[PDB]
Design a protein around this ligand. Structure first.
Ligand code: ADP
Ligand code: ADP
Ligand code: ADP
Ligand code: CA
Ligand code: CA
Ligand code: CA
Lengths: 313, 313, 313
């Protein structure tokens, strides 16, 4: 559980300015502790006089200094690996989708990217014993291709009350690139008033191929995309929630898998890349393209009327 | 072994001001001996009255005057060349990573930069007979892509106790440019209370492409980066420890290899540049871009589940 | 051979004050003869009473009055032109590096500035018949990029005993601007106890871009640099030794070649400027930017494992 921004009020910072820290999007103390000095002066009100003082006070409330690897080992061993819904993939991922980082699944059209995200939108409220996360979910949508009709079909596969499963998940369409980033600001708000566990952006680079569809602004197409993925990694180690993004890839304009999603400036954004491919048969393959800890391996899976599942045969 | 700042107390300097030398970041006597007169007056407390006196006393405790090349030859022949983990590269580097200077590996995405740094994070506590350094390690991380899961895999390749290997290494994430430089201050502290041998900044220019992502502050993007690489060369001849930084390079915003890492003001920062490139096959090549002593040569290597290794065939 | 300061003791000056002339840096009689009345009163001890008397006595010991051009012609024809190591450049320079003045080579990064200085650090102890100078050498270093590994490689190219070549050269790192100027004071000392022939400052303006890296002190960045180049021209006609400085230049903060090295107050410091540039091919060009006697011309050269050499083809 993070530390809300109200705890910083009693720490030595005024009240009229803490509300100003809020309007900038910062909702907790780690959000400012993970922020540089340059970003706080950009606020129209506050200046360098307080900015030194606030960041100094925030530093003590958030562990920021060095630490051992053993202490980081037993703390990294404790992160939740969200159940993928198919036992073959859990072994490929040594648990499943790992929270606190960016998970980027990219594959050709018709590969289950939309339904994998759907199945994950319910497997996250499963109890930890069931490999879940006991946390709320969120599914910001861009293609317009999300609908509860598939969610209750997966609740019955795992024995849940779909009446409350739809309550434990939120949703909003995205029409524009500026509305995609703006929606994260709102998203960053209600993640404080609750305990979400899985944000889903499907698809991330979808809306960037339609608005920024010119040849002169290829620079701006990535500058604006970088600012988007920045706050996404932001919200990942801020609330420690899993974030899963989606991309559509061509076989032969961030579509070439030879280049990462975060263009070149933020290319270190995605920490786990899963390439989804239809095999020679009617059976799907997930390939873990890059994840320092997990091998470059493969597994097979399939999709049923009840979500992601293991291969039939 | 350096000379701690406490030895300067008994040399003729007060106690309330030696604590002030500490708060400025100076932890030993060489740290002030390698400092100019301009930098000590910038302290809010002390003035030019003592600054002449302190630097005069520090001068005698640290060999500062001229010397012969023969005396520098046999003293430079004694520096440790950290074992790279692949025998082909030791010949390319005439030993491996040379301590007391800045080592900058830069290559395209997916080139082992992250895992080479990983393998070096254990090869440094090897005994000198095993080409190691018998010194602690440090891995300040920026991409978030570091994890012990690969370290114990390399300890078994060299026969070590991974339970203590993680104890002999420290680690901390970096989120902001101002937090990158601030973390060195803390780093400069616990390097006195122990004997580190290899600092690793991976990646150095990573966080400078995300915060300073505008067009007007291209000057400030390098001014702040210079102050970072300054203290890095600082800590290199201060404790005589090896410092290895990392950079991600585009094929076709310090990403063009035609320009050095330290922009233009501190461009003399990196003393050994190694360009990492995937060949026409599935085999990697390290090329020593610039190192006055080592030829502009090439070697091949590969990465396994147990760290950097020689080519399979 | 200069006249040491001890000869001034028997000339009519006391002993307790001649030691005071020493502590001020003045090691011979020309050093005070080339000094103004204003500079001697700045000493805490002596006053205008002796200052008139000392400078009057020093005047007779050092030829100071007028002279003909013929007498200056045959005396200027006798100055040594240090062999550059590449026959093409000797013709461009009508002999090579001319002693008794300031030689400033400036070029882009990766132009041989470091290795040209290296090759000159051995060509100076060559006998005069071999175009050398039969004098000791000195290489005060700032970038940290000097090492004997290249010196013995050039001794074998000219047939020398590298065991003694390193003895005939001295060296010291420079970390700060105040340590750069302070090192000249020591340098001015042991140049009396021996016969040096080539001082090398590589690079001169390097350390002035790191300490004086602010916007308010652009005045002080040159004031302090002027005091440095002052004593450098000082030591040039004092011991008549060659002094070669180095500068790193940007293509598009004394980096613009449109402005000289000595900023504006001492801009007459450098007497020969050589611009080093990588041509359209892998071959280097030296261009003599300014030298009243030598034409504005060009030549080509190259660098091998054995120092500066003529073009291969
Ligand atoms: N309700 C469903 N029940 C079963 N299979 C489905 C269902 N909807 C889609 N599929 C199958 O899953 C794939 C499409 O899933 P989807 O996640 O929408 O993929 P993508 O977004 O890549 O087009 C196709 O192979 C399709 O036959
Ligand atoms: N655990 C591992 N075991 C074996 N090979 C790995 C492992 N992790 C990554 N690799 C391989 O090494 C490269 C990635 O290494 P990494 O140091 O993370 O590179 P970079 O940071 O340049 O992306 C890829 O070729 C990948 O296949
Ligand atoms: N030991 C060496 N043997 C041969 N060529 C070298 C050697 N070291 C450097 N070079 C070459 O000389 C140039 C670098 O020389 P250097 O004097 O260090 O230049 P700069 O200081 O301008 O970077 C490059 O073209 C490099 O390929
Ligand atoms: Ca879809
Ligand atoms: Ca990396
Ligand atoms: Ca150089």
């Amino acid at each position: 559980g993070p530390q809300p921004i109200s705890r910083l009020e009693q720490c030595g910072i005024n009240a009229n300015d803490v509300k100003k820290l809020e309007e900038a999007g910062f909702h907790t103390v780690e959000a400012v502790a993970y922020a540089p000095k340059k970003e706080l002066i950009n606020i129209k009100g506050i200046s360098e006089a307080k900015a030194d003082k606030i960041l100094a006070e925030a530093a003590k409330l958030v562990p920021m200094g060095f630490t051992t690897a053993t202490e980081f080992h037993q703390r990294r061993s404790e992160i939740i690996q969200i159940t993928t819904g198919s036992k073959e993939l859990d072994k490929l991922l040594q648990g499943g989708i790992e929270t606190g980082s960016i998970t980027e699944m990219f594959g050709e059209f018709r590969t289950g990217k939309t339904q994998i995200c759907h199945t994950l939108a319910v497997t996250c409220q499963l109890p930890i014993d069931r490999g879940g996360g006991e946390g709320k979910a969120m599914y910001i949508d861009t293609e317009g291709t999300f609908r509860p009709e598939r969610l209750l079909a997966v609740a019955e596969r795992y024995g849940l009350s779909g009446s409350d499963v739809l309550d434990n998940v939120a949703y909003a369409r995205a029409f524009n690139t500026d509305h995609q980033t703006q929606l994260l600001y709102q998203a960053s708000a209600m993640m404080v008033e609750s305990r979400y566990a899985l944000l889903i952006v499907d698809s991330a680079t979808a809306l960037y191929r339609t608005d920024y569809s010119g040849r002169g602004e290829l620079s701006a197409r990535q500058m604006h995309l970088a600012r988007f993925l920045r706050m996404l990694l932001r919200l990942a180690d801020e609330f420690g929630v899993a974030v899963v993004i989606t991309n559509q890839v061509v076989a032969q304009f961030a579509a070439d898998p030879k280049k990462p999603i975060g263009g070149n400036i933020i290319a270190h954004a995605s920490t786990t890349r899963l390439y989804l491919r239809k095999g020679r048969g009617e059976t799907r393959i997930c390939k873990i393209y890059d994840s320092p800890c997990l091998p470059e391996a493969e597994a097979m899976f399939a999709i049923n009327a009840d979500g992601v599942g293991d291969a039939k045969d």
